[model samples]
Target: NLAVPFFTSIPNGLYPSKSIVISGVVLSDAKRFQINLRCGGDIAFHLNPRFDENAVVRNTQINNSWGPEERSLPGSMPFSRGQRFSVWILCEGHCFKVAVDGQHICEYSHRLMNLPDINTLEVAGDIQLTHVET
Candidate 1:
């Protein structure tokens, strides 16, 4: 089985049209889960789905400090507490397009200009991850 809190390299690093796919099931008692795209000491993208607020929060962490959180979505919450979910983070020239269960969710612009520097992917918090592709 694959690890729950998973970490892996991006091989040749990220560029336009690159994509990361994560599929998993949220624990029945989960509070939240996070997926972070890291650039060494900084986090270029932080995707966190919180049950308490019923929102999916997106943010960036630079130099260990968090930036303003982005929590607006086009529709209602796509994740249920005890549901299986698939997340696709598609990298483009200027922003990352996120989709949940094949539905387009949000677009997060590049906060870290050097896309290749964001070479590590981390998935953590209350979920049983089934697979990961970096």
Candidate 2:
């Protein structure tokens, strides 16, 4: 059993080939959930899945101001209510590659370029966390 609204520091920060894996089951009445890669007061990457909109939105937030939101997916929504899901966020030279349920989802270009400074990983919202590896 793990805690919700999870937060952890990534060891050695981040680099190419580094990956963060998260596993959880969505609550039956879930409306949304989010995973964030944080740099102090900033959010380098914000991955939000909105069941109400049937969309997975990604963005960067700096100084509390959010950048453009990316909601286009390669296919239909990959998450479902009351279902187990695995998310993999892989750090690359220029972007973060994310996957859901073992399938590559999207690549979000670096907004906060200092990889090592982006040391915190945060998961929150409607889900029961089972595992988190940073």
Best by TM-score: 2
> Candidate 2: worst 10 consecutive residues by lDDT?
1-10
lDDT of candidate 1 over 16-96, digit per residue (tens): 999999999999999999999999899999999998789999999999999999998999998999899999999999999
The C-alpha RMSD in Å for every predicted model, in order, reads 0.9, 0.8
lDDT scores of the candidates, listed in order = 0.93, 0.94
| Native-to-model Cα distance after best TM-score fit, residue 37 in candidate 2, in Å | 0.4
| Residue 85 C-alpha lDDT in model 1 | 98
Task: Please count the clashing residue pairs in each candidate, in the order shown.
Answer: 0, 0
Residue by residue across 1-134, what tens digits does model 2's lDDT show?
A: 37878899999888999999999999999999999999999999999999999999999999999999998899999999999999999999999999999988899999889999999999999999999999
Write down the worst ten-residue block by lDDT for model 1.
1-10
Candidate 2 residue 77 C-alpha distance from true site, Å = 0.1
Candidate 2: give the clashing pairs: none
Off by over 4 Å in 2: none
